[PDB]
Design a protein around this ligand. Sequence first.
Ligand SMILES: CCCCCCCCCCCCCCCCCC(=O)OC[C@H](COP(=O)(O)OCCN)OC(=O)CCCCCCCCCCCCCCCCC
Ligand SMILES: CCCCCCCCCCCCCCCCCC(=O)OC[C@H](COP(=O)(O)OCCN)OC(=O)CCCCCCCCCCCCCCCCC
Ligand SMILES: CCCCCCCCCCCCCCCCCC(=O)OC[C@H](COP(=O)(O)OCCN)OC(=O)CCCCCCCCCCCCCCCCC
Ligand SMILES: CCCCCCCCCCCCCCCCCCCC
Lengths: 504, 601
Amino acid sequence: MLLPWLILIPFIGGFLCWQTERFGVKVPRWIALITMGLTLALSLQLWLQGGYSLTQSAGIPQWQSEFDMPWIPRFGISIHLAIDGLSLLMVVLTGLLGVLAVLCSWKEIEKYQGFFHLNLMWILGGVIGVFLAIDMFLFFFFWEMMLVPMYFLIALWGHKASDGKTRITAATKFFIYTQASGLVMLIAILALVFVHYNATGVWTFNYEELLNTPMSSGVEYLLMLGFFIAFAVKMPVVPLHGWLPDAHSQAPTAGSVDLAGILLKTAAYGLLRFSLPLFPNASAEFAPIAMWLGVIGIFYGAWMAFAQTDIKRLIAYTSVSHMGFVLIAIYTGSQLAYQGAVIQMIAHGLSAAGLFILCGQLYERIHTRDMRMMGGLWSKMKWLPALSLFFAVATLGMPGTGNFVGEFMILFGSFQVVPVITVISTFGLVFASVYSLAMLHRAYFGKAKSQIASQELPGMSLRELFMILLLVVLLVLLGFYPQPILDTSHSAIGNIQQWFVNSV
Amino acid sequence: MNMLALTIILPLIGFVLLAFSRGRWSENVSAIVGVGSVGLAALVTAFIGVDFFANGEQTYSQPLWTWMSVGDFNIGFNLVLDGLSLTMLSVVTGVGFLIHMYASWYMRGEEGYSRFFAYTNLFIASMVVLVLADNLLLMYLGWEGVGLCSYLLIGFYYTDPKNGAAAMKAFVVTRVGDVFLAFALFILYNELGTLNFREMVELAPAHFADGNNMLMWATLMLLGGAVGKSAQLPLQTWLADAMAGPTPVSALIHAATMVTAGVYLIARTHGLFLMTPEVLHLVGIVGAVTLLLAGFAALVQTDIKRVLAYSTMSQIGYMFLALGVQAWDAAIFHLMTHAFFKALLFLASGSVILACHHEQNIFKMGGLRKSIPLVYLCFLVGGAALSALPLVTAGFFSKDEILAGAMANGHINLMVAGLVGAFMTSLYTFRMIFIVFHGTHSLPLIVLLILSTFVGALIVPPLQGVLPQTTELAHGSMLTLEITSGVVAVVGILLAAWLWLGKRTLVTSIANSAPGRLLSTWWYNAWGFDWLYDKVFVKPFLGIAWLLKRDPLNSMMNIPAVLSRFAGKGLLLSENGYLRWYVASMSIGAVVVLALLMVLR
Ligand SMILES: CCCCCCCCCCCCCCCCCC(=O)OC[C@H](COP(=O)(O)OCCN)OC(=O)CCCCCCCCCCCCCCCCC
Ligand SMILES: CCCCCCCCCCCCCCCCCC(=O)OC[C@H](COP(=O)(O)OCCN)OC(=O)CCCCCCCCCCCCCCCCC
Ligand SMILES: CCCCCCCCCCCCCCCCCC(=O)OC[C@H](COP(=O)(O)OCCN)OC(=O)CCCCCCCCCCCCCCCCC
Ligand SMILES: CCCCCCCCCCCCCCCCCCCC
C-alpha cells in the first residue's frame, strides 16, 4: 500500500515542476529535488521496515509488500505492485540516480526547464513502475511509457553542439528499437495469456497466475524468444546494441538523462523476474546461445570502447561489456552468480553514472569531447582527473570497488556452471582494463594537443564535488562491505534460482 | 599482539590525507605525514615482531569482518600471521620506510610530491594486505592493489607518453597474470569450497584421491599468476620497461613489494604444490630459464636501471629455482637479502643519476669513483652482495643455501644453471660497475649498507614451523659447493676486471663481429620476447580495433531501415497522379482478386 506512492510521487512532482515554472524560472529544480528526495527517503523507509535481511527463500510468489487494484477487468488486468529485495534495491538505486540527475541539471536556468524536469520525473517514475509491476500489461505499459519523455529529452534538450538533425536521428533510432522490442514482448505476453486461457478458462495478465502454465516446447521457446528480444534491446545485447552509443552521445550534455533513463538497466531485472520463472525449460535450452551472446558482447564492447574517439561512446560500450557479463550470469543456475549479477548491476550503475557526470563536467569546462584533441589535463584542473581516474579504476574491475565484487561472484558461479565461458570472460576483464587505461591515457595524461587543453580550467563546484564524492563513498563501501546488499537480495535471488533449477 | 590492522590502516590514512591535500600543504608537512605513516607502520611491525617472538612463534589470527557470504561462498576479511607473514611484513615496512626517507630527500622541488607519497603509501598498504591475507581473495585484493599502484607509480611523470606506455604495458601484462590467478581461484573454490590457505591444505588430500588433474591445473594457474606478478617466463617483458618512473619507485617495486609477491604466493600455497610435483619442477625450470635469460640479457645493456632490472629478474629466477627444489627457507632468506641489496643498489643509482644530469648512457661516464666516494662504496657493496662475494656478503649465503637445497633434492641441472647464473651475475654486475665508475652520508644508505653485508645474513627468518625443513646436505659436499661457488664468483670478478677495466680491445672486437653484433642485438631486446608479444597480441588487437571502429553490427542492423526507405521510394512511383493509371490499377486489382478466388476455390 506504499508502492503506488513510490510511482505517483514522481508523476505528481513532474506535474508540479511544470506548473511551478510561472512562480520563477529557478523554482522547478527545487521541486524536483524535493520530490526525488521524498521518493528516495520513502524507498529507504521501505528498506528499513521491510526486514529483508531476516527473510528466507519461500518460493515464487513471495513479496514483502503488495498492492492490487482493478484496471481493465475485461482482460483481468490490474495495477498490481509488489516489492521484495531485488525490486527494492533497484528502486533505491533509481531514487538515488534521480536525485543525482536533478542535482546534475542544477545551474541550467533556461526557458521551459519545468518541462525538462517533468520528463525527468516521468522517466524516473516509469523506471520505478517497471521495477514494481508484477503483471504483464502494466509492466509493458511502464516499459514503453518511459520512452516518450526519453525521446523528447534527447531530441529537444540534447547536445547543443549537435546538428539538430543528428539528435532527431539518434532519438528516433532509440525509440524505434525500444518500441519494436516492446511490441514483440506484447505479442509474447498476449500469446502466453491466450495459452493460459485455453488451458484453464479464465482471463488474467498476472505473473503469479501465469506461472506453471502448461505449454509445449516450441510455444515456450517462442515466448522466451519474444521476451529475450525485448530485454536484449534494452540491456543491450549484441547485435541489438546500436541505439545506445548514439543515444548517450546525443543526450543532454549535463548527463542527467543518462542516469535517469539510459544508464539504469531494467532488462537484467526483467530477465530475472519474467524470463527464468515463466519459461525455465526454454531458458535452459537457450542458455548456450545467450551465454555466447554475452561473451561476444563483452569482447565486442571492449573492442568498440578502445576504438572510440569520444568519451561518451566509450562509456556506452563499457556498459555494453558489463551487461554482457550480467547476461552471462543470468542464464546459469547458480545463486552465487545471480548475487554477483545484482552487485554488478548496482556497482556498474554507480560507476558509469559517476563517469557520465564527470564527462558532462569536463565538456562544460572545455567545450569538446574529442579524446584526440585534449590531453594532459591532470595539471590543469583541481578535482576532475583524480575522480575520473578513480571511476576508471572502478569500471576496470578493481577491488575496493563493487564492480570487482560483482563480476567476480559472477565468474565464480559461472565457473561452477560452465568453465570455458568463464575463461573467455576473464580475458574480457583484461580487455576492460585495456580500454580503461586507453581512455585515461588519451584524456588526462601526456602533452596537451590543443590550446584549450593548454589553459587553466576552473575547478568543480561544491555540489558536483559532493555528489561525485557521495558516489565514490558508496562504491568503496559496496566494494569493502557488500553484505547488506547481498542480504537484501538473497531471498528474491534464492526464489528465482530455486524456481529455475528444479523445474527443468 | 593484534595491531596488524594498524599496520594496514596507517598507510591508508596517509594515502587519504595526502591525496585529499592535493598539493596545498608544504613539502615538509606532506613529507612528514607520509614518512611518519610508514615509519609508524614499521614501528608497529617491530612491536608485532617483539610480541610474536615473546610467545612460542604461534600463528595469530585477527578476523576483522566477513567480506562476502553467499551460501557456501564464505570469503572472510581476516588477517593471518606466521613466520612467513612476519618476514614479509617486516621486510615491506622496513625497506619501505628507508625508501620513503630517501624519496623525502629525493623528491624535493618536484611536482606531485603529495601525490607521489600518497601513491607509495597506498602501495605499502596494498602489499601489507597481500602478505597478511588469510584467504586467496584478500590476497587477490592486495594483488590488484599493488598492480594498480605499480601502474600509478611507473607513469608518475605522466607528461612523457613513453612513461604512460610503459605503465600500461606493465598493467596489461600483470592483469594477464592476475587472470591466470583468478583461474586458480575458480578451480580451487570449485574443487574445495573454500579459499583459506590452512583449510585448502587440510581438505586438499581427501578430495583428490581419485583425480589430480584439477589440483594440477590449480597449481599451474597459481604458477602462471606468480610469474605474471614476479616478471618471469613468459610474462617478464614489462619489468625492463618499468623504469620510466622514479628510482625510489623502482627500488620499491624491485626490492620491497612487487616482484616478491609471486614468491610469497608459491611459498604460502606450498601445501598444494607438494601434491603436484610436476608443477613444482616446472616452477624450478621456469626460474632457471628466467635467471639464465636475464643474465644473458643484462650483459649487453647500456643503462644502469635496465641492468638492475634484469639483475632483479635473475634474482627472482633464483628464488623460483629455490622454490622448485623445495628449498623454501633458502628462498625466503634470499628474498630478505636481495630486497636489502637491491634497495641499496637502486638508491645508489638514483643518487648517481641525480648527481649527474640528463640520465645518460653508462658508456659516456668513467672514473666516477673519485667524484662520489660514498655512492661508489654503496654501489661496490651492493655489487659484491649481488655477485655473491664469499664470507662478507649475505648474497653468498643466500645463493649457497639455494644451491645446497638444489643438491640435496638431486637437482643437478638446476645446480649447474644456478652456477652459470652466478657467474653471469658477477660478470654483468662488475661489468656495469667498472664501466660507469672506472675509466652526504644519508642514513637509509648507511642502513642498507649495513644490511647488505654479513650483518644481514646474521638475521634468520622464523620459518621453522610454517615451511617444511630443507633436506640437509653432507658436510663435504656442502664445503665443496661453497668452494665451487667462491671460485666461480671470483673467476667472474677477475674476468670482468680483465675485459671491461682497461683498454677494452677484446670486448670491442667481440662486439664488432657480425655474430657478436647479432648476439648483442638479440640479448638487448630480451631475446625477442617484446617483439614476439607485440606481433602476436598488440598488432592484431589494434588491427581488429581499426577494422571494427565503424560498428559493423550497427550497419547489419541498420540495413532494414535502408530496405524500408528503398521500398518506400519504389512504392511511391505508383502515385504518379494519373487517373487513367488509377483506373488501370483498380482493374488490375480486380483481375488479381478474381484470379485468386478462382485459384483458391
Ligand atoms: C585498501 C587498502 C589497499 C588495498 C588495495 C586497494 C586498491 C583500490 C584502491 C582505489 C583507490 C583509488 C586509487 C586510484 C585513484 C587515485 C586518485 C589520486 O591520484 O589521488 C591523488 C590526488 C592528488 O594528486 P595531486 O597531483 O596532488 O592533485 C591533483 C590536481 N591538483 O587526489 C585528489 O585529487 C583528491 C582525491 C581523489 C580521490 C582519491 C581516492 C578516493 C577513493 C578512496 C577514499 C574514499 C574516501 C574515504 C572513505 C571511504 C568509505 C569509508
Ligand atoms: C583492505 C584494507 C584493510 C581493511 C581496512 C580498510 C578497508 C577500507 C575502509 C573503507 C571501507 C570500510 C568498509 C567496512 C567497515 C567495517 C565493516 C563492519 O563494521 O563490519 C562489522 C564488524 C563487526 O564484527 P562482526 O560482528 O563479526 O561482523 C561481521 C561482518 N560481516 O566490524 C568490525 O569488526 C570493525 C573492525 C574495525 C574496522 C576499522 C576500519 C577502519 C578503516 C579506515 C580506512 C581509512 C581509509 C579509507 C579509504 C581506503 C581506500 C579505499
Ligand atoms: C605466446 C604464448 C604465451 C602467451 C603469454 C600470455 C600473453 C602475454 C601478453 C604480454 C604482452 C602484452 C602487451 C600489451 C601492451 C599494452 C601497452 C601498449 O602497447 O599500448 C599501446 C596502445 C595504447 O593505446 P592508445 O591510447 O591508442 O595509444 C596511442 C598510440 N599508442 O595500446 C594497445 O595497443 C593495446 C594493447 C592491448 C593488448 C591486449 C593483450 C591481450 C593478451 C591476451 C593473452 C592471452 C593468453 C592466452 C592465449 C591463448 C592460450 C591458449
Ligand atoms: C617514525 C618512527 C620510525 C621507526 C623506524 C623503525 C625501523 C628502523 C629503520 C628501518 C630498518 C629496517 C630493517 C629491516 C629488517 C627486517 C628483518 C626481517 C626479519 C624476519
